[PDB]
Amino acid sequence: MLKQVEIFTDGSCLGNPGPGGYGAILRYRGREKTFSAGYTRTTNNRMELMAAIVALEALKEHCEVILSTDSQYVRQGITQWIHNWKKRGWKTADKKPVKNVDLWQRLDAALGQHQIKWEWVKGHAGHPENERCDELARAAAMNPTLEDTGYQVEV
C-alpha cells in the first residue's frame, strides 16, 4: 500500500499563452486517480502549479505526500520565492503583487495541511508517470474545455 501518497505532475500549454493542459496522478493508498483538463488559452507555469494544486486539493484526510514533479517554476517557487512572499505579503518590494499570485496563494493552502516532500525530477525519461502526466497535458491541450480566468494577460 502507498502508505501515504505519491503524486505525479506536469502540464503543457501549446503557445505562450495558448491552450494549456494539466497532467497528474495521485496513487491513493493503492489504485490511482488521475487529473486532466483543457484551458482555452493559458501557460506552462499556471498548468504545473495548477496541477500541483488539484492533486493536493482532493486529499480529504491529512496525507504525507510525495509530490514528484519536473518543474523549475514550482521548484524555483518553493525552495526560493515563497519564503520571501509570506514574509512580505505576496508583493514585490516594489509593493506590486506577484504574477500568478492567484494560483500561488492556492497551492499554498493545500501545502499547509499536509506534509509535503518535493522530489524535483530532471527525470524526463523517468518514472512512467512523470511522462504519463505529460501525455495527459498534451492530451487536454488538443481538447480545451475551460477558460483560465486567473490568467490575466498582464500586470
Kindly list the residues in this chain that would bind Mg ion in the complex (CB under 5 A): 10-11
Q: How far is the CB of 73 from Mg ion (least distance, A)?
A: 9
Residue nearer to Mg ion on the CB measure, 4 or 150: 150
Q: How far is the CB of 8 from Mg ion (least distance, A)?
A: 11
* HEC per residue, the chain: CECCCEEEEEEEECCCCEEEEEEEEECCECCCEEEEEEEEEECCHHHHHHHHHHHHHCCCCCCEEEEEECCCCHHHHHHHHHHHHHHHCCECCCCCECCCHHHHHHHHHHCCCCEEEEEECCCCCCCHHHHHHHHHHHHHHCCCCECCCCCCCCC
Residue nearer to Mg ion on the CB measure, 11 or 111: 11
- Of 33, 28, 37, nearest to 5 by C-alpha is 28
Q: How far is the CB of 121 from Mg ion (least distance, A)?
A: 11
48 in a known ligand binding site: yes
Residue nearer to Mg ion on the CB measure, 63 or 77: 77
10 in a known ligand binding site: yes
Residue nearer to Mg ion on the CB measure, 10 or 129: 10
Q: How far is the CB of 5 from Mg ion (least distance, A)?
A: 20
Residue 140 and residue 4 in contact, taking contact as beta carbons nearer than 8 Å: no
- Active site (catalytic) residues: 10-11, 48, 70, 124, 134
70 in a known ligand binding site: yes
Beta-strand pair 18-26/64-69 = unpaired
129 in a known ligand binding site: no
> Which residues are documented as binding site?
10, 48, 70, 134
Residues belonging to the binding site for Mg(2+) are 10, 48, 70, 134
